[PDB]
Design a protein around this ligand. Sequence first.
Ligand SMILES: C[C@H](CCC(=O)NCCC[N+](C)(C)CCCS(=O)(=O)[O-])[C@H]1CC[C@H]2[C@@H]3[C@H](O)C[C@@H]4C[C@H](O)CC[C@]4(C)[C@H]3C[C@H](O)[C@]12C
Ligand SMILES: C[C@H](CCC(=O)NCCC[N+](C)(C)CCCS(=O)(=O)[O-])[C@H]1CC[C@H]2[C@@H]3[C@H](O)C[C@@H]4C[C@H](O)CC[C@]4(C)[C@H]3C[C@H](O)[C@]12C
Ligand SMILES: Nc1ncnc2c1ncn2[C@@H]1O[C@H](CSCC[C@H](N)C(=O)O)[C@@H](O)[C@H]1O
Ligand SMILES: CC1(C)S[C@](C)(C(=O)O)N[C@@H]1C(=O)O
Ligand SMILES: [Cl-]
Ligand SMILES: [Se]
Length: 346
Amino acid sequence: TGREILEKLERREFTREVLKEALSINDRGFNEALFKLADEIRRKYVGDEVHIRAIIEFSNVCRKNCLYCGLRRDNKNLKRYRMTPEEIVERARLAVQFGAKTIVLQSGEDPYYMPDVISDIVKEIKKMGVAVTLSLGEWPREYYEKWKEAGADRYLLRHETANPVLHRKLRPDTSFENRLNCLLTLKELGYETGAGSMVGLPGQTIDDLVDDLLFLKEHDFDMVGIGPFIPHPDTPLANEKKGDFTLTLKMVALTRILLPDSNIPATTAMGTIVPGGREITLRCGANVIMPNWTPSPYRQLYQLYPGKISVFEKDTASIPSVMKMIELLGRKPGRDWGGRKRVFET
Ligand SMILES: C[C@H](CCC(=O)NCCC[N+](C)(C)CCCS(=O)(=O)[O-])[C@H]1CC[C@H]2[C@@H]3[C@H](O)C[C@@H]4C[C@H](O)CC[C@]4(C)[C@H]3C[C@H](O)[C@]12C
Ligand SMILES: C[C@H](CCC(=O)NCCC[N+](C)(C)CCCS(=O)(=O)[O-])[C@H]1CC[C@H]2[C@@H]3[C@H](O)C[C@@H]4C[C@H](O)CC[C@]4(C)[C@H]3C[C@H](O)[C@]12C
Ligand SMILES: Nc1ncnc2c1ncn2[C@@H]1O[C@H](CSCC[C@H](N)C(=O)O)[C@@H](O)[C@H]1O
Ligand SMILES: CC1(C)S[C@](C)(C(=O)O)N[C@@H]1C(=O)O
Ligand SMILES: [Cl-]
Ligand SMILES: [Se]
């Protein structure tokens, strides 16, 4: 019964069977109660502030060939671009002028910048008195150390899938063991570390999703980014099914219940599969939003998946838009950098 599962969730009995049953039950009443629980846990632990992370997708060059990704190296039907360091720093300054208190630098795994151009950019942005988050993929420990010395605060590296067999198949350049090692290194070096996963990957099962939740709980990540898999037409997975919004929303809600003091975004992928999907997610456990701050003409070239929102409006629309969103949700903008505020418990 759904009631018994909520009760166990409420009492923090986070066993594999409780999580599987939560993900397996499709009853509307159960789902709504689950979302309300997550919403309330969010409010009690991390409050009503929604933290804004302005993302600059500074290069769509990638050396890897992940099967799901539109930036995979085998995709010749994409115009590749690189922003200059000056462009990236000045675009970050514009976001800070617009009120962003974290700048996210995201790219394909593009060797050109690595490690020293990144270090130089990070130092320049840190002079602006904001947090800097990097999401550059897998690199040597030395690179991650140089970027931490340069001033980077956080690093996003979704674990993608905690099933090693499926991980290797979908990411043939690498492995779950390497992904995990990178995440452990980043934690050791003192980054706030973000993990997370896609929901609805071809071949991924409900038990796989459970394992993603247990993985997250085990490592106590500061941030958890979750969204659906969205097939991209220029990839091997073009004809596979998109991930289900509701199932993905349940993964966000359970992540909040399991990691009550974590930072959890309402991802752009949630708002791509369903109109208004970010706003729903912010009411089901999420507390972070990541407006796209990539300038034209590059913005439209950063297509990890199609339909990726926020492309036809002026490239300065997204920060204002998310501030309006936060108000109409009855929430507040973050006042500080929105680092994790751990609540130590039993
Ligand atoms: C807005 C709609 C429809 C509400 C509605 O239209 N219900 C009929 C009228 C109710 N009113 C009280 C306005 C008047 C009643 C007098 S009347 O004369 O109209 O019958 C309601 C119906 C189900 C609600 C979601 C679920 O909970 C799950 C979840 C819980 C979180 O915590 C917050 C997020 C989320 C997604 C909820 C959001 C929102 O809240 C929903 C969509
Ligand atoms: C960038 C330009 C020119 C002046 C400038 O370069 N301004 C730097 C401000 C730096 N900060 C954001 C750190 C100030 C924080 C002050 S505060 O008192 O908010 O703490 C200034 C002039 C008017 C400013 C907008 C309006 O105001 C309305 C609105 C307020 C929200 O709030 C943030 C978003 C928004 C759209 C603003 C963005 C930006 O800012 C604008 C465009
Ligand atoms: N087709 C697709 N559908 C939904 N999410 C996708 C996707 N392709 C990629 N992503 C997501 O995009 C995220 C950032 S990719 C850019 C950063 C870095 N190259 C990296 O791989 O970490 C990935 O972690 C993955 O979860
Ligand atoms: C490119 C991503 C999948 S990674 C990020 C920023 C996150 O979850 O941290 N959300 C993005 C999106 O949903 O488009
Ligand atoms: Cl961040
Ligand atoms: Se690493």
